């Protein structure tokens, strides 16, 4: 009956007896649906009754509250008649409910609750006040009482956004038409980037409606943001066209420089938007000729950046409109470009930048039509570094694009400031088709770096088996290249510790025990690293019988000792433990226990006490390793 | 395409009795100029007294400064309007 607004059957119902504060399940009152029916005969009947209100619904909507959620202004002075509190909205965040009637947006209501809600201004808890909500949700009539009843639009928040700064954010033009009727001064700063309401006006979706009426009471488009760029930059970046048609025509100059000397045209590429970028050459063609358009599209930002530089780095993810970024290369070349552009500090082109990131699925193809032969200048220039595309698409494995390069024949030959090629960036991070594609274009296997690295030095040092099986199966690489330092790749790949790859080098085959430039068997490189499974590799198979190994130091125990390899020494003495504990070293007489000492390893010495290892054994020199311990200061040893 | 806002053309031609129907019919103040110029603006410009004392009276404060800052005297000095400026320093 009181969601009914039935009166007759409250009366009887009433008079049966019934609960005046009833609750339902959603728990609002049958007087607060009363005074939310906007029925004053149900809220006289139950005031009748003195009717409890305080219990409200779960969303704390009382009977002004939830009145004012309807927007009845005699069911909340008869709220007040059934002794409301006006002064007690609050709902953890400043609910405040002047707030309510500039959420709906009733001024009759608004009245009533200004002589009984009295409070004008508590604010939010993000420290919005009753104008800041009322410009945010577009109630015209609030604002125009609000504002008979007494506050300044210079108001902020905690975020320090005046009220323009809320209604341009939502974007209602007749609102913002009101706050610059009230007073409001269209220059005056913004939260945390400190900001002109333009710059609101150029960045939410829909600032066409409203930019204008920014520009009907005058605006500065001159007016630089905290880092330096006026709103036709901020039109550039979020892709809003017909504010930024507003912005040029309100003479604001596409010509301004930002702090990173970006122009408008600058971030408008790099956001991927066309229809800007055309407007934008279509405007400076005009007002500047084209010469200076010519120059307007190659100006230069800072680090030697131009605009088809900010063409190239946006991606196939991140594109999200099917041919943007081809028409838009297309505009930037057809009207005029320096191609090249060789950048100020990593020498760079905007070329490299196609081969960073991948859009040159597309782009490649659009930049690479419009030069009859000089592509290939473009393609034989190297970086900073020393790269070509090659070398970046091929260090970052798009496959598709490394096969656009090879069909537009740039030289496999590149080489950077390490003297590798791409065979090696491509080993490097271990692409199986990127390789392929380089082979068939006639690339040289068995290239060497300053390190004289060759790929499957690369393919071994960092875990590719397939690249593997790929260049020595495929291609017939050769298996026991030497370094500079004379290693092979079976313990270049112990060093890095990879065992299925030293699995996949022995299923293959080559020299094992092939001494290094240090003289060193491949145990030894894999216990400087301390790698227990791999010299569990070269031992359990047990190929060599390298336990009783030598090199031109030691044996590989006593560079276990050395490491602190307890692990690496647990396997060694779990296999030959009678053979690794008399490791006396031909060119020192040293045992594993004085350097285990003199390494200060207290684990490697209860390792091999654990195994035997009498302390007694003189050195060259002559020292038990308890000597040895007293020169290097381990008291754990002791 | 300017900001007539036509208060403002109450200042262009000075119509007191205009002004004051315009004021309860043409309810706004203060909506400035594409120059950012408001009524007291145009009305300091164009040498209209009677405006300056309705829109005086009816509230603004002639340290009211446009996009390019000038302030009443900044413009009713440009025309060089003298009773104008008798009538700001009153303000």
Redesign the interface.
């Known amino acids: 009956a009181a969601r009914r607004r039935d009166v007759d059957m409250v009366r009887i119902l009433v008079d049966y007896g019934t609960n005046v504060d009833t609750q339902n399940g959603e728990g609002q009152t049958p007087l607060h649906i009363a005074a939310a029916e906007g029925d004053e005969a149900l809220l006289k009947y139950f005031y009748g009754v003195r009717a409890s209100a305080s219990i409200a619904d779960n969303q704390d909507r009382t009977p002004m509250h939830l009145a004012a959620e309807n927007g009845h202004a005699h069911v909340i002075e008869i709220l007040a008649d059934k002794f409301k509190a006006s002064i007690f909205e609050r709902t953890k965040d400043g609910s405040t409910l002047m707030h309510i009637a500039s959420l709906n947006g009733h001024a009759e209501c608004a009245t009533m609750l200004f002589k009984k809600g009295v409070y004008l201004h508590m604010p939010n808890k993000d420290g919005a006040r009753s104008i800041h909500t009322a410009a945010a949700y577009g109630h015209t009539g609030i604002i125009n009482t609000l504002l008979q009843k007494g506050e300044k639009v210079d108001v902020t928040t905690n975020d320090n956004y005046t009220a323009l700064h809320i209604a341009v954010e939502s974007a209602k033009p007749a609102v913002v ?1 009101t706050l ?4 409001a001064d ?2 005056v700063r913004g939260g945390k980037l400190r900001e002109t309401p333009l710059h609101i006006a150029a960045r939410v979706k829909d600032g066409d409606r409203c930019a204008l009426m920014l ?6 488009p001159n007016l630089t943001t905290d880092d330096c760029l006026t709103p036709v930059h901020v039109a550039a970046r979020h892709g809003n066209l017909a504010t930024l048609m507003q912005l040029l025509e ?1 003479e604001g100059d596409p010509l301004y420089k930002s702090n990173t000397g970006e122009t408008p045209l600058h971030m408008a590429c790099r956001a991927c938007h066309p229809d800007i970028v055309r407007h934008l050459i279509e405007t400076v063609k005009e007002k500047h000729g084209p010469d200076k358009a010519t120059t307007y599209i190659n100006s230069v930002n800072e680090d030697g950046a131009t605009a088809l530089h900010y063409t190239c780095q946006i991606t196939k993810e991140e594109v999200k409109i099917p041919e943007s970024d081809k028409q838009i290369v297309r505009m930037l070349l057809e009207n005029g470009a320096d191609v090249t552009l060789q950048t100020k500090t990593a020498l760079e082109t905007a070329f490299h930048y196609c081969a960073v990131a991948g859009n040159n699925d597309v782009l490649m193809e659009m930049i690479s039509h419009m030069n009859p032969t000089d592509i290939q200048k473009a393609m034989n220039r190297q970086s900073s570094v020393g790269w070509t595309p090659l070398l970046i698409a091929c260090h970052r494995g798009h496959m598709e694009l490394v096969n656009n390069l090879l069909a537009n024949h740039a030289r496999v030959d590149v080489f950077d400031t390490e003297g590798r090629s791409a065979l090696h960036l491509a080993a490097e991070r271990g692409y199986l088709h990127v390789c392929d594609a380089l082979l068939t274009n006639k690339a040289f296997i068995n290239s060497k770096s300053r390190v004289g690295r060759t790929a499957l030095h690369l393919a071994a040092m960092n875990g590719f088996t397939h690249l593997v099986k790929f260049l020595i199966k495929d291609h017939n690489a050769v298996i026991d290249i030497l370094t500079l330092r004379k290693q092979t790749p079976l313990h270049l790949a112990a060093a890095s510790g990879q065992m299925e790859v030293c699995q996949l080098l022995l299923e293959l085959g080559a020299n094992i025990d092939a001494t290094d430039d240090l003289g060193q068997k491949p145990i030894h490189v894999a216990a400087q690293n301390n790698y227990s499974e791999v010299a569990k590799l070269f031992l359990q198979q047990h190929p060599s019988l390298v336990n009783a190994t030598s090199k031109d130091g030691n044996t590989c125990a006593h560079i276990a000792a050395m490491q602190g390899s307890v692990k690496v020494i647990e396997e060694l003495m779990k296999f030959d433990r009678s053979g690794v504990i008399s490791a006396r070293n031909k060119l020192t007489d040293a045992t594993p226990l004085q350097l285990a000492a003199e390494g200060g390893h207290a684990d490697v010495v209860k390792a091999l006490v654990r195994a035997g290892a009498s302390c007694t054994e003189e050195n060259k020199a002559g020292f038990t390793a308890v000597h040895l311990a007293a020169q290097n200061g381990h008291g754990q040893v002791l």
């Open positions: 038409e610059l009727g009230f007073g269209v220059h520009l009907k009471s005058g605006a500065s309100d």
